[PDB]
């Protein structure tokens, strides 16, 4: 059977029911009539259907225990996510993609944040591949710039593709960083190398050379010792009449950076695997979203027949967006 029920909070359920619970197809609006689910129900819970927020953003896919769960597609402003959901949040595997450019992330997620392994393609076409935690590049991974003249101009200290931006560059130069990241920044041991032959091997903090390391310039000359915020503050040479161990500390930092770069390459391989599984789950989510739109159409017709004057707000939400 079917019916219309009002909740104390101002929302409504209109649709099929059995044993005092939503069952079959039906529409349910949120408190004060804001937000709308339209789709199938089993024993009080959504199963396959669409949610529309007042902004016009939508989720179309599967549900469990009252939440987005399993495969589904979310459209939120200029970003769409296709893939798996768990207890209302993105994950484990899926793809978030821009509606108008190739910028995207493919890989794993935790609680709606990029987390585990994956690859982000930035607006300029450059990438990060490797480990993520809590939405941030964190662990080991590789940053690949595009040519400098094409790369997005971002202020220091947030910029991560060319670090630092200084005069050993031309419009064609690219930069790669392979090594450790902390909290979205180059931090710890790592190697940066440019296509003009410049290279730094050593320690980083806050996207800057910081600690011991060696820079080789395109002409083959070197600057090495202890860096503070990208500035060399102690060189290798001892004073005329001196104990210090700068030479040894630089050599140990170079070794640490080369090991971290190798580890980052290992993490890239895992991240590439995760992106292939994420793309497969995104394609599966496209099918889940189609099923949800079909169930939504049935639910709209059921509620229109039961309660012709009940306002289903979802279509107008999308129209006004």
Curated annotation (Swiss-Prot):
Tissues with expression: Abundantly expressed in skeletal muscle. Very low levels in heart.
Natural source organism: Homo sapiens (Human)
Subcellular localization: Cell membrane; Endoplasmic reticulum membrane; Sarcoplasmic reticulum membrane
Linked pathology: Congenital myopathy 25: A form of congenital myopathy, a clinically and genetically heterogeneous group of muscle disorders characterized by hypotonia and muscle weakness apparent at birth, and specific pathological features on muscle biopsy. CMYO25 is an autosomal recessive form characterized by prominent facial, ocular, and bulbar features.
Biological role stated in the UniProt entry: Junctophilins contribute to the formation of junctional membrane complexes (JMCs) which link the plasma membrane with the endoplasmic or sarcoplasmic reticulum in excitable cells. Provides a structural foundation for functional cross-talk between the cell surface and intracellular calcium release channels. JPH1 contributes to the construction of the skeletal muscle triad by linking the t-tubule (transverse-tubule) and SR (sarcoplasmic reticulum) membranes.
Family affiliation: Belongs to the junctophilin family.
Modified sites of kind Phosphoserine: 156
Protein name: Junctophilin-1
Swiss-Prot/TrEMBL MORN repeat ranges: 13-35, 37-58, 59-81, 105-127, 128-150, 177-199, 200-222
Domain notes: The MORN (membrane occupation and recognition nexus) repeats contribute to the plasma membrane binding, possibly by interacting with phospholipids.
């Amino acid at each position: 059977t079917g019916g219309r029920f009002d909740f104390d909070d101002g929302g409504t359920y209109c649709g099929g029911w059995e044993e005092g619970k939503a069952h079959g197809h039906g529409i349910c609006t949120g408190p004060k009539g804001q937000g709308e689910y339209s789709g199938s129900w089993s024993h009080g819970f959504e199963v396959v259907g669409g949610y529309t927020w007042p902004s016009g953003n939508t989720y179309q896919g599967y549900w469990a225990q009252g939440k987005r769960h399993g495969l589904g597609v979310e459209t939120k402003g200029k970003w769409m996510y296709r893939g798996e959901w768990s207890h209302g949040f993105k994950g484990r595997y899926g793809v978030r993609q821009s509606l108008c450019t190739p910028a995207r992330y493919e890989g794993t997620w935790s609680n709606g944040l990029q987390d585990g392994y994956g690859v982000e393609t930035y607006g300029d076409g450059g990438t990060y591949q490797g480990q993520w935690a809590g939405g941030m590049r964190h662990g080991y991974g590789v940053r690949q710039s595009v040519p400098y003249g094409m790369a997005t101009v971002i202020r220091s200290p947030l910029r991560t593709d060319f670090c630092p931006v200084e005069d050993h560059v031309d419009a064609t130069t690219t930069e790669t960083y392979m090594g450790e990241w902390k909290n979205d920044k180059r931090n710890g041991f790592g190697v940066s190398e440019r296509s003009n032959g410049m290279k730094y091997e050593g320690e980083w903090a806050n996207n800057k050379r910081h600690g011991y390391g060696c820079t080789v310039f395109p002409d083959g000359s070197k600057e090495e010792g202890k860096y503070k915020n990208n500035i060399l503050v102690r060189g290798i040479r001892k004073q005329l009449i001196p104990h210090t161990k700068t030479r040894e500390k630089v050599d140990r930092a170079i070794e640490g950076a080369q090991r971290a770069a190798a580890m980052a390459r290992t993490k890239v391989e895992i991240a590439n695997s995760r992106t292939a599984h994420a793309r497969a789950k995104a394609d599966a989510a496209d099918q889940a979203a189609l099923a949800a739109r079909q169930e939504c159409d049935i639910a709209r017709a059921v509620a229109r027949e039961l309660s012709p004057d009940f306002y289903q707000p979802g279509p107008d939400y999308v129209k006004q967006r």
